[PDB]
Amino acid sequence: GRCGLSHECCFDISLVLSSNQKLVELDLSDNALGDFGIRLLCVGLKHLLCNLKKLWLVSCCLTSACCQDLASVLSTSHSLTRLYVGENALGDSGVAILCEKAKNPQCNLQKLGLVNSGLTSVCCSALSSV
Amino acid sequence: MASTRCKLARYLEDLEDVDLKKFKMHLEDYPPQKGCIPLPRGQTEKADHVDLATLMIDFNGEEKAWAMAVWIFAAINRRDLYEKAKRDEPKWGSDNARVSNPTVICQEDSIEEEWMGLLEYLSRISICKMKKDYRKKYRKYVRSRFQCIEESVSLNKRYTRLRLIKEHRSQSPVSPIKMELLFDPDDEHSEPVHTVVFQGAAGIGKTILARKMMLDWASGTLYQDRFDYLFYIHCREVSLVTQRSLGDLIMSCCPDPNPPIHKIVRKPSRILFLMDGFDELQGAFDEHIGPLCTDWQKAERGDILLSSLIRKKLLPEASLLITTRPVALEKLQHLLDHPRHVEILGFSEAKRKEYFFKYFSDEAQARAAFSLIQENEVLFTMCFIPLVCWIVCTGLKQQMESGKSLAQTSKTTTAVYVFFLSSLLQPRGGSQEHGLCAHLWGLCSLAADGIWNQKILFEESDLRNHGLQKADVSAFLRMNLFQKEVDCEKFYSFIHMTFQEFFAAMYYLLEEEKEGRTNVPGSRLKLPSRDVTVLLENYGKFEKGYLIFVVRFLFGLVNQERTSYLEKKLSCKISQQIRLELLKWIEVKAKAKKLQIQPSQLELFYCLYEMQEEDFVQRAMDYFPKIEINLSTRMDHMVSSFCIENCHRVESLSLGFLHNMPKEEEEEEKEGRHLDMVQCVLPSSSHAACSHGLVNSHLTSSFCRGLFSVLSTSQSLTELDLSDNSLGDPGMRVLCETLQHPGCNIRRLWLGRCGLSHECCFDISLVLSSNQKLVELDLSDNALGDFGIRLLCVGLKHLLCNLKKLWLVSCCLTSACCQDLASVLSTSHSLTRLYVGENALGDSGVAILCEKAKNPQCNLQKLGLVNSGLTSVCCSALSSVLSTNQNLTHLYLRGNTLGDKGIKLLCEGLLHPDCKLQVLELDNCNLTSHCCWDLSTLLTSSQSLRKLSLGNNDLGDLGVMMFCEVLKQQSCLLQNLGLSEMYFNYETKSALETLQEEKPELTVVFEPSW
Amino acid sequence: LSTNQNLTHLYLRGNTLGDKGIKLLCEGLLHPDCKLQVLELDNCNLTSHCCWDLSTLLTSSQSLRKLSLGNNDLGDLGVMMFCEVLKQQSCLLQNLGLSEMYFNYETKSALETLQEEKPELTVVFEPSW
Ligand SMILES: CC(C)(O)c1coc(S(=O)(=O)NC(=O)Nc2c3c(cc4c2CCC4)CCC3)c1
Ligand SMILES: Nc1ncnc2c1ncn2[C@@H]1O[C@H](COP(=O)(O)OP(=O)(O)O)[C@@H](O)[C@H]1O
C-alpha cells in the first residue's frame, strides 16, 4: 500500500497472483494505478486464485469503468471474502454495475468498503435490492 | 498648416547639434519677453525635436512657442533658421494632444463636461449625420422582409445554435466560432481574409441559416457591430445573360428610388455579401471563363458578374459568405483560394425533440408523436437534416386532423416523401373527377422541365403551359403552402428543390401519364425525354444540378411491393427494364473509372439502401471489392452498415481520413519496390496533440457497434484497412470482440498511423490469440510504447505461428521492448518479416535484437531497421548474426549512421559462405569512398546478394569508378544496384551509360541521371 | 512541324502552354509527313484533359520515339490511358518519362506490371521505387 506503482506493475502483479495461489491477502491501497490495471488484475484474480479473500484498493485513482471489470471477477470469484474499493472515482454510475454482480448466490463476499466514494442517494435504490 | 509643432520640430531638425544645445540652453534661460516662461532644463534636454516643439506649445501656447524659437534662432546665431522663422508664420490651430481632461493655470481649470459636447457639435457637421442616415434605414429595411404572413412568422424563436464544425486547415482546438468572430482568423494568420463557405447536405438549412444570420445582425444584436454592412443575395432571381450590374444586383436587395450606391461604394472589406446556394445557380458555368470583369458598374453577364465577385478581382476587399452543396464544391474550390470551409450538421437526438418544442403546441401532439420516432429508430437515424423533421411533424400533424399515427412506414427517405403525399392527396384526390394524379403528372412535367430547362421560377407564364393556371394549382399552392410569395414580385416557384427532383423521378416511372393520356396544356414540344439513360449520361453535370436526388429517388420509388397497394397508378415492365438499365449504370461505374467528380461509393450505397430486397442490390454490390468510403453521421454509418449486409466474400474495406495512403507499401517477396518512409509533412507534432485531447463526445460506442457487427458477420472477408482513422481504444475493444468471432475470417488487418495505445495492445493481443487466420498486421506510426510490446508478445506466442509480418515503426518504442521482441522471436515459428525501424531502440536495444537471431529456428527473412538511430558499435553484433542465420535475406538501414568502420564489419558479416543475404539498404548511412573498395570485393565474391542501395553517401568519383571494375570482373552477376541524390560532373555519368549498355544482366539504376 | 522535313526534336520544359496549346501540338504532328522523334513537355502546365488527345496521336504516330510530360496535372485517369496505350499494340514507342508528382499505390500499381509486360517501350518513372 501507499507506494507509487502503476499499470505495468499490475500486469506483473496479475502474473504474481496467478503463480502464488498461497497468497491470501493483498493491499494495493493508495497506489495511483487506474482502471487498465484493474482489468489485468481481474484476469489474475480468476486463475488458480479462489484462495484470495481480501483486497485493498482504495485511493488508486480508479474511474467508474473499472466497475465493469470488478463485476465479472466477482461474478465468478469463489472465496473473495472482503473488498475495499472506497475513496476511488466510481460514482453512482460506477456502482450501478457493482450492484448487478451481487445478485447471485455465488457471491461469497462478506464486507464492503465504499467509504468516501462520492456516491449519492440515487445508488441506494440498487444496493437496497442487493 | 494644421500643426505649428510639426513646423517647429522641422526647424529643430534643421538646427545643428551645437545650435540645438545652444537652443536648449536659450529655451531654459529665455528672458521674460511677451509673457514667455522658459522651459525646465530636464524637459528641454530629454525632449527630441518633435517633443521639444510639443513642450514649447504646451508651456506657453503655439504663438509664443514660435516667437520664442525666432528669438532663440537669432540668439544662437542660426541666421538661416531665424530668417526661416520670420519667413514662415504658422496658423495657431493646435496639434494632437492627449489632454482628454482639459487643464488651465486657474484652479477651476476645465473638465470633460458639457463644454466638450458643445465644442464637438460646433465643429462636427457631416460625419455623424451621414453615418446616421446610412445606418437606421439599411438596418430596418433588411429586417422587414422575412415575417408577418396572414409558418414563416417567427424565426429567431426557431434558432437552435445549429452545429458549426469549421473545417480545420486540411494540411485539437475547438473554437466553434458560431456567431462571434466567425469570420475572424486566429492570432493574425490572415487579417484580410474575406471568403467563408458553408458545406451542408441538401435540406440542412443553409438557406435558413443565412436568413437567421441576417435577422440576428439586422438588429446589431451583439453581432459583428465592428462590421458595417451585410448583403443577402439568393440566386433564385439571379440568372444567366441578365447583363445587370452590381448596383442593379445591390438595388435588388433594397430598391432605393435614389440609390446611394456612390456612398455604398465606400470602405471595401467593411461590406459583406451573403451569397446563397451555388446549387441555385441554374445553367452552364465555366469556372475559368475567358472574358474577365473588373468594372463594378458595367452591365455584365450574370455569371461573369459572379465570376469577378467570386474571384474578388472586382471589389478586392469585399467579404463573401457562400452556402454551397458539397457535391458542387470542386467548381468553386478550383475557382477560389483560401476558402473558410464550414461543415454544418442537423439536429441531434435531443435537439430533434427540442425542434418539436419549437414546432408543436401540445405534448399530446408533441410527446406522443415524438415517442413514435424513438421506437422507429430507422426513422430516428433518418431524422437528421432538419428538413425531413419538418416533413415528419407537418405530415403527422395533418394525420392527427383526421386520425391516429402508425409505424409511418418511413423506413427510407422516399418513404417519408410518399407518406407525406398520401396525407396530402386526401380530400379531393380520391374522387376520380377531382383526381389530381393527372395534375400530379402536370406538376411533374413542370418539375422535369425545372432542371431540364433550368427554370425554377416558372411563374404564371409557364404554369399555364403545364396546368390549370388558376383553379387547380391554387389547391396545390395552398397544399404546398409556398409557391409564389418567396419572390414577392410576380414569379411562381416550388417549396424546395428536393420536391422538384422528387417529382422529376416520379414522372419517369409514371410513363408520362402512361402512353394513353397526354392532353398537354399547349405543350406539343419541350417534353424532356422519357428515357432514363440520358439522365445517367448527364449525371454529375452542373448544367443539370448533379442529378443526385433524381437518380437517388428512383431506387426508392421502384419498390414493387410498397407501391403496389400504395399507388396502383404505377409503372410497368418499363420499370423492370429500367432496373436493368440502372443495374448497368452501377455496374459500369465501379469497373470502368474510379476517378470522377463524385459518384461516391457510399453515394451508390445510398441508392442500394433505398432499393430494398436482396438480389438487385446484391448484383450491384458484387461489382466492387474496392470499398473506400468516409462516414460523417449515424445515417452514413447506417447506410454503409446496411448495404454491406448484402453480398459476401468482399475483399477490402477502407475507412477513415485517407485521401492519401502512403507509407504502407507491401513488399511480399522478390519485389522491385519496398516500403519507404513518407511521414507526410504537416502532421508533425499536431498528430500527437490531437491523440490526447480529441474529446469528441459525439463519437461513442455507437456509430461503431452496428458497423462492425457487419464485420463480425464478414462471411469470407479477407482484408480490412483502418489507416489514419481517429479510432481510439474503446472502439478498438469493440473491434477486438468483433475479430474474436469465429466467423470473422479476416486475413489481413491494417491499423497504421492511428492513435492507439497500450490498453488496445491488451485488446489487440487478445485478438491475435483468437483470430489465428490473421496473417499480417500493421501497427506503424501508432504511438503505443513498450508495455504494449510485452502484451502483444504473449499474443504472438499463442495459436499464432501463422503471423508472418508485423509493421511497428514510429510507435515511440524504447530499447526495453527489445528484451520482449527477442523472446517471441526466440520461439516464433513462421514470423517472416519484421518492421521495427524508426523507433528508439538504439545500439543498446539491438544488442538484444542480435542475441535472438543466432538460432536456426529464426524463420525471419526481412528486417526493417531504417532510421533507428543505431551506430557503428552495433555492427559487430549483427555481423555475426548474418552468418549464423540461415533465413534472414533482407536488411533495411537507410538514414541510420554507421560510417565505414561499421560497414567494414558488414563485408565480414557477409564474408561467410553460409550467408543468405539478398537485399541490403545503406542509403543515407553516412558512408565514404573508403569502404566502397571493401564492399565491392564482397560483391564480386558474394553470389547470394541481389540488390544494394548506397545513395546519400560519400561515394566519390574514385569509389563509383570501381563499379566499372566490378563489371570488368565477370563475377558481377548482381541483379540490381541503386545510387542516387549526389551531384557529380560528366565523368560519373560518362562510364555509366556505356557499361549499362554493355551490361543487360545487372539492373544498375542512377536516379538523378538523365 | 508539318512543313519541316528535318526538325526531329523540340524541348519545351518549364514553359507554360496549357492544354489549349498542346491540343494544337497533336494536330501539329497529325500530318504523316512529320519527322518528330523527341519532345519535351515537362513542367508545361498541362492537365489530364489533353492527355487523351496526345495519346491518340502517340498510337497513330510512328515517327516519335520519346516524350516527357512531368510536373503536370496528369491525374490518375490520365496516367491510366497509358495502359490503354499498351493495350493498343500500335504502341511501338521507344521511351516515356514522367516524374515529380506524388500519387498513391494505384498509379504505380499498373506501372510495374505493364513495364514487366512491355520490353519494347522504355517507360521510366523517376519518383518510383
Ligand atoms: C456524402 C454524400 C455524398 O452522400 C452527400 C453529402 O451531401 C449530399 S446531398 O445530396 O447534397 N444532401 C442530402 O442528401 N441530404 C439528405 C440526406 C438524406 C436524406 C435526405 C436528404 C434531403 C432530404 C432527404 C440522408 C443523408 C443525406 C450527399
Ligand atoms: N434551424 C432550423 N430550425 C428549424 N427548421 C429548420 C432549420 N433549418 C432548416 N429547417 C427546415 O429546413 C427547411 C428548409 O431547408 P433549406 O434551408 O432549404 O435547406 P438547404 O438550404 O440545405 O436546402 C425548412 O422547411 C425548415 O423547416
Coordinates of N, CA and C in Angstrom, one line a residue, chain B residues 128-271:
Chain B
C128 N -21.2 62.6 -38.5 CA -22.3 61.9 -37.7 C -23.6 61.8 -38.5
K129 N -24.0 62.9 -39.2 CA -25.3 62.9 -39.9 C -25.3 61.8 -41.0
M130 N -24.1 61.8 -41.7 CA -24.0 60.8 -42.9 C -24.1 59.4 -42.3
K131 N -23.4 59.2 -41.2 CA -23.4 57.8 -40.6 C -24.8 57.4 -40.2
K132 N -25.5 58.4 -39.6 CA -26.9 58.0 -39.1 C -27.8 57.7 -40.3
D133 N -27.7 58.5 -41.3 CA -28.6 58.3 -42.5 C -28.3 56.9 -43.1
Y134 N -27.0 56.6 -43.2 CA -26.6 55.3 -43.8 C -27.1 54.1 -42.9
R135 N -27.1 54.3 -41.6 CA -27.4 53.1 -40.7 C -28.9 52.8 -40.5
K136 N -29.6 53.5 -39.6 CA -31.0 53.1 -39.3 C -31.8 52.5 -40.5
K137 N -31.7 53.3 -41.6 CA -32.5 52.9 -42.8 C -32.1 51.4 -43.2
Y138 N -30.9 51.2 -43.6 CA -30.4 49.9 -44.1 C -30.9 48.9 -43.1
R139 N -30.6 49.1 -41.8 CA -31.0 48.0 -40.8 C -32.5 47.7 -40.9
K140 N -33.4 48.6 -40.6 CA -34.8 48.3 -40.6 C -35.3 47.6 -41.9
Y141 N -34.7 48.1 -43.0 CA -35.1 47.6 -44.3 C -34.8 46.1 -44.4
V142 N -33.5 45.8 -44.2 CA -33.0 44.4 -44.3 C -33.8 43.6 -43.3
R143 N -34.4 44.2 -42.3 CA -35.1 43.4 -41.2 C -36.5 43.1 -41.6
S144 N -37.2 43.9 -42.3 CA -38.7 43.6 -42.6 C -39.0 43.0 -43.9
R145 N -38.3 41.8 -44.2 CA -38.7 41.1 -45.4 C -38.8 39.6 -45.1
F146 N -39.0 39.2 -43.9 CA -39.0 37.7 -43.5 C -40.0 37.3 -42.4
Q147 N -41.2 37.7 -42.4 CA -42.2 37.5 -41.3 C -43.6 37.8 -41.7
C148 N -44.5 37.8 -40.7 CA -45.8 38.5 -40.7 C -46.8 38.2 -41.8
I149 N -46.7 37.0 -42.4 CA -47.7 36.4 -43.3 C -49.1 36.4 -42.6
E150 N -50.2 36.6 -43.3 CA -51.6 36.4 -42.8 C -52.6 35.9 -43.8
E151 N -45.9 29.7 -42.2 CA -45.3 29.4 -41.0 C -44.1 30.4 -40.7
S152 N -43.7 31.1 -41.7 CA -42.6 32.0 -41.6 C -43.0 33.3 -41.0
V153 N -43.4 33.2 -39.7 CA -43.7 34.4 -38.9 C -42.8 34.6 -37.7
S154 N -42.2 33.5 -37.2 CA -41.2 33.6 -36.1 C -40.0 32.8 -36.6
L155 N -38.8 33.4 -36.5 CA -37.6 32.8 -37.0 C -36.5 32.7 -35.9
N156 N -36.4 33.8 -35.1 CA -35.3 33.6 -34.1 C -35.9 32.6 -33.1
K157 N -37.2 32.5 -32.9 CA -37.7 31.6 -31.9 C -37.3 30.2 -32.5
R158 N -37.2 30.1 -33.8 CA -36.7 28.8 -34.4 C -35.2 28.8 -34.6
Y159 N -34.4 29.1 -33.6 CA -32.9 29.2 -33.8 C -32.2 27.9 -33.8
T160 N -31.8 27.4 -32.6 CA -31.1 26.0 -32.3 C -29.6 26.0 -32.2
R161 N -28.9 27.1 -32.4 CA -27.4 27.1 -32.3 C -26.9 25.8 -33.2
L162 N -27.4 25.7 -34.4 CA -27.1 24.6 -35.3 C -25.6 24.3 -35.3
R163 N -25.2 23.0 -35.5 CA -23.8 22.6 -35.4 C -22.9 23.4 -36.4
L164 N -21.7 23.8 -36.0 CA -20.8 24.6 -36.9 C -19.4 24.1 -36.7
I165 N -19.0 22.9 -37.2 CA -17.6 22.5 -37.1 C -16.9 23.0 -38.3
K166 N -16.1 24.1 -38.1 CA -15.4 24.7 -39.3 C -14.2 24.0 -39.6
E167 N -14.1 23.4 -40.9 CA -13.0 22.6 -41.3 C -11.7 23.1 -40.8
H168 N -11.0 22.3 -40.0 CA -9.6 22.7 -39.5 C -8.8 22.7 -40.8
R169 N -7.7 23.5 -40.9 CA -7.0 23.6 -42.2 C -6.7 22.2 -42.6
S170 N -7.0 21.9 -43.9 CA -6.8 20.5 -44.4 C -5.3 20.4 -44.8
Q171 N -4.4 20.4 -43.8 CA -3.0 20.3 -44.0 C -2.5 21.4 -45.0
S172 N -6.5 19.1 -29.9 CA -7.0 20.0 -31.0 C -7.9 21.1 -30.5
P173 N -7.7 22.3 -31.1 CA -8.5 23.4 -30.7 C -10.0 23.2 -31.1
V174 N -10.9 23.7 -30.3 CA -12.3 23.6 -30.5 C -12.8 24.8 -31.4
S175 N -12.8 26.0 -30.8 CA -13.2 27.2 -31.4 C -14.4 27.1 -32.3
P176 N -15.6 26.9 -31.7 CA -16.8 26.7 -32.6 C -17.1 27.9 -33.4
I177 N -16.7 29.1 -32.9 CA -17.0 30.4 -33.6 C -18.3 30.5 -34.3
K178 N -19.4 30.2 -33.6 CA -20.7 30.1 -34.2 C -21.1 31.5 -34.7
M179 N -21.1 32.5 -33.9 CA -21.6 33.8 -34.3 C -20.5 34.9 -34.2
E180 N -19.9 34.9 -33.0 CA -18.9 36.0 -32.7 C -17.6 35.6 -33.4
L181 N -17.0 36.5 -34.2 CA -15.7 36.4 -34.8 C -15.6 35.1 -35.6
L182 N -16.7 34.7 -36.2 CA -16.7 33.5 -37.1 C -15.8 33.8 -38.3
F183 N -15.9 35.0 -38.9 CA -15.0 35.4 -40.0 C -13.6 35.7 -39.5
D184 N -13.4 36.0 -38.3 CA -12.1 36.4 -37.8 C -11.1 35.2 -37.8
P185 N -9.9 35.4 -38.2 CA -8.9 34.3 -38.1 C -8.4 34.1 -36.7
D186 N -7.4 33.2 -36.6 CA -6.7 33.1 -35.3 C -5.7 34.2 -35.1
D187 N -4.8 34.1 -34.2 CA -3.8 35.2 -34.0 C -3.1 35.6 -35.3
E188 N -3.4 36.8 -35.8 CA -3.0 37.2 -37.1 C -3.5 36.3 -38.2
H189 N -2.6 35.3 -38.6 CA -3.0 34.3 -39.5 C -3.3 34.9 -40.9
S190 N -4.5 35.4 -41.0 CA -4.9 36.1 -42.2 C -5.9 37.2 -41.9
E191 N -5.5 38.4 -41.7 CA -6.3 39.5 -41.3 C -7.3 39.9 -42.5
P192 N -6.8 40.0 -43.8 CA -7.6 40.4 -44.8 C -8.4 39.3 -45.5
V193 N -8.6 38.2 -44.8 CA -9.4 37.1 -45.3 C -10.8 37.5 -45.5
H194 N -11.5 37.1 -46.6 CA -12.8 37.6 -46.9 C -13.8 36.5 -47.3
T195 N -13.3 35.3 -47.6 CA -14.1 34.2 -48.2 C -14.4 33.2 -47.1
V196 N -15.6 32.9 -46.8 CA -16.1 31.8 -45.9 C -17.2 31.1 -46.7
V197 N -17.2 29.8 -46.6 CA -18.1 28.9 -47.3 C -18.7 27.9 -46.3
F198 N -19.9 27.5 -46.5 CA -20.6 26.6 -45.6 C -21.0 25.3 -46.4
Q199 N -20.6 24.2 -45.9 CA -20.9 22.9 -46.6 C -21.9 22.2 -45.8
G200 N -23.0 21.8 -46.4 CA -24.1 21.1 -45.7 C -24.9 20.4 -46.7
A201 N -25.5 19.3 -46.3 CA -26.3 18.4 -47.2 C -27.6 19.1 -47.6
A202 N -28.1 18.7 -48.7 CA -29.3 19.3 -49.3 C -30.5 19.2 -48.4
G203 N -31.0 20.3 -47.9 CA -32.0 20.3 -46.9 C -31.6 20.6 -45.5
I204 N -30.3 20.8 -45.2 CA -29.9 21.0 -43.9 C -30.5 22.3 -43.3
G205 N -30.5 23.4 -44.0 CA -31.0 24.6 -43.5 C -30.0 25.8 -43.8
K206 N -29.0 25.5 -44.7 CA -28.1 26.6 -45.0 C -28.8 27.8 -45.6
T207 N -29.9 27.6 -46.3 CA -30.7 28.7 -46.7 C -31.4 29.3 -45.5
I208 N -31.8 28.5 -44.6 CA -32.4 29.1 -43.4 C -31.4 29.9 -42.6
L209 N -30.2 29.4 -42.5 CA -29.1 30.0 -41.6 C -28.9 31.4 -42.0
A210 N -28.8 31.6 -43.4 CA -28.5 33.0 -43.9 C -29.6 34.0 -43.5
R211 N -30.9 33.5 -43.6 CA -32.0 34.3 -43.2 C -31.9 34.6 -41.7
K212 N -31.5 33.6 -40.9 CA -31.3 33.8 -39.4 C -30.1 34.7 -39.2
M213 N -29.0 34.4 -39.8 CA -27.8 35.2 -39.6 C -28.0 36.7 -40.0
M214 N -28.8 36.9 -41.0 CA -29.2 38.3 -41.3 C -30.1 38.8 -40.2
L215 N -31.1 38.1 -39.8 CA -32.0 38.5 -38.8 C -31.3 38.8 -37.5
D216 N -30.3 38.0 -37.1 CA -29.5 38.3 -35.9 C -28.9 39.7 -36.1
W217 N -28.0 39.8 -37.0 CA -27.2 41.1 -37.1 C -28.0 42.2 -37.7
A218 N -29.2 42.0 -38.2 CA -30.1 43.1 -38.7 C -30.7 43.9 -37.6
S219 N -30.3 43.6 -36.3 CA -30.6 44.5 -35.2 C -29.3 44.8 -34.4
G220 N -28.2 44.6 -35.0 CA -26.9 44.7 -34.2 C -26.8 43.5 -33.4
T221 N -27.6 43.3 -32.3 CA -27.8 42.1 -31.5 C -26.5 41.6 -31.0
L222 N -25.5 42.4 -30.7 CA -24.2 42.0 -30.2 C -23.5 41.1 -31.2
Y223 N -23.9 41.2 -32.5 CA -23.2 40.5 -33.6 C -22.0 41.4 -34.0
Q224 N -21.5 41.2 -35.2 CA -20.3 41.9 -35.6 C -20.6 43.4 -35.9
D225 N -20.9 44.1 -34.8 CA -21.1 45.5 -34.9 C -19.9 46.3 -35.4
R226 N -18.7 45.7 -35.2 CA -17.5 46.2 -35.8 C -17.4 46.0 -37.3
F227 N -18.5 45.4 -37.9 CA -18.7 45.3 -39.3 C -19.9 46.0 -39.8
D228 N -19.8 46.8 -40.9 CA -20.9 47.8 -41.2 C -22.1 47.2 -41.9
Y229 N -21.8 46.5 -43.0 CA -22.9 46.1 -43.9 C -22.9 44.7 -44.3
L230 N -24.1 44.1 -44.5 CA -24.3 42.7 -44.9 C -25.3 42.7 -46.2
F231 N -25.0 41.9 -47.1 CA -25.7 41.9 -48.4 C -26.3 40.4 -48.6
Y232 N -27.6 40.3 -48.5 CA -28.2 39.0 -48.8 C -28.5 38.9 -50.3
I233 N -28.1 37.8 -50.9 CA -28.4 37.5 -52.3 C -28.7 36.0 -52.5
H234 N -29.9 35.7 -52.8 CA -30.2 34.3 -53.1 C -30.4 34.2 -54.6
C235 N -29.8 33.2 -55.2 CA -29.6 33.1 -56.7 C -30.9 32.6 -57.4
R236 N -32.1 32.6 -56.7 CA -33.3 32.3 -57.4 C -33.6 33.3 -58.5
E237 N -33.5 34.6 -58.2 CA -33.7 35.7 -59.2 C -32.5 35.8 -60.1
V238 N -31.3 35.6 -59.6 CA -30.1 35.7 -60.5 C -30.1 34.6 -61.5
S239 N -29.8 35.0 -62.8 CA -29.8 34.0 -63.8 C -28.7 34.5 -64.8
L240 N -28.5 33.7 -65.9 CA -27.5 34.0 -66.9 C -28.0 35.1 -67.8
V241 N -27.1 35.7 -68.6 CA -27.4 36.7 -69.6 C -28.2 37.9 -69.1
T242 N -28.3 38.0 -67.8 CA -29.0 39.1 -67.2 C -28.4 40.4 -67.6
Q243 N -27.1 40.5 -67.8 CA -26.4 41.7 -68.1 C -26.7 42.9 -67.2
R244 N -26.7 42.6 -65.9 CA -27.1 43.5 -64.8 C -25.8 43.8 -64.0
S245 N -25.7 45.1 -63.6 CA -24.6 45.5 -62.8 C -24.7 45.1 -61.3
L246 N -23.6 45.3 -60.6 CA -23.6 45.0 -59.2 C -24.6 46.0 -58.5
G247 N -24.6 47.2 -58.9 CA -25.6 48.2 -58.4 C -27.0 47.7 -58.7
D248 N -27.3 47.2 -59.9 CA -28.5 46.5 -60.1 C -28.7 45.3 -59.2
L249 N -27.7 44.5 -59.0 CA -27.7 43.5 -58.0 C -27.9 44.0 -56.6
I250 N -27.2 45.1 -56.3 CA -27.4 45.7 -55.0 C -28.8 46.2 -54.8
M251 N -29.3 47.0 -55.7 CA -30.6 47.6 -55.6 C -31.7 46.5 -55.6
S252 N -31.4 45.3 -56.0 CA -32.3 44.2 -55.9 C -32.7 43.9 -54.5
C253 N -31.7 44.0 -53.6 CA -31.9 43.8 -52.2 C -32.8 44.9 -51.6
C254 N -32.5 46.1 -51.8 CA -33.3 47.3 -51.4 C -33.5 48.2 -52.5
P255 N -34.6 48.2 -53.2 CA -34.9 49.1 -54.3 C -35.0 50.5 -53.9
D256 N -33.9 51.2 -53.7 CA -34.0 52.6 -53.3 C -34.3 53.5 -54.5
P257 N -35.4 54.3 -54.4 CA -35.7 55.2 -55.5 C -34.5 56.2 -55.8
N258 N -33.7 56.5 -54.8 CA -32.5 57.3 -55.0 C -31.3 56.4 -54.5
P259 N -30.8 55.5 -55.4 CA -29.7 54.6 -54.9 C -28.5 55.4 -54.5
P260 N -28.1 55.2 -53.2 CA -26.9 55.9 -52.7 C -25.6 55.2 -53.0
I261 N -25.6 54.3 -54.0 CA -24.5 53.4 -54.3 C -23.2 54.0 -54.3
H262 N -23.1 55.3 -54.7 CA -21.9 56.0 -54.7 C -21.3 56.1 -53.3
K263 N -22.2 56.2 -52.3 CA -21.8 56.0 -50.9 C -21.8 54.6 -50.4
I264 N -22.4 53.7 -51.2 CA -22.2 52.2 -50.9 C -20.8 51.9 -51.4
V265 N -20.4 52.6 -52.4 CA -19.0 52.4 -52.9 C -18.2 53.2 -51.9
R266 N -17.9 52.6 -50.8 CA -17.1 53.1 -49.7 C -16.7 52.0 -48.8
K267 N -15.4 52.1 -48.3 CA -14.8 51.2 -47.3 C -15.0 49.7 -47.7
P268 N -14.3 49.3 -48.7 CA -14.3 47.8 -49.0 C -13.7 47.0 -47.8
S269 N -14.2 45.8 -47.7 CA -14.0 44.9 -46.6 C -14.8 45.3 -45.4
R270 N -15.4 46.5 -45.5 CA -16.4 46.9 -44.4 C -17.8 46.4 -44.8
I271 N -17.9 45.8 -46.0 CA -19.2 45.4 -46.5 C -19.1 43.9 -46.8

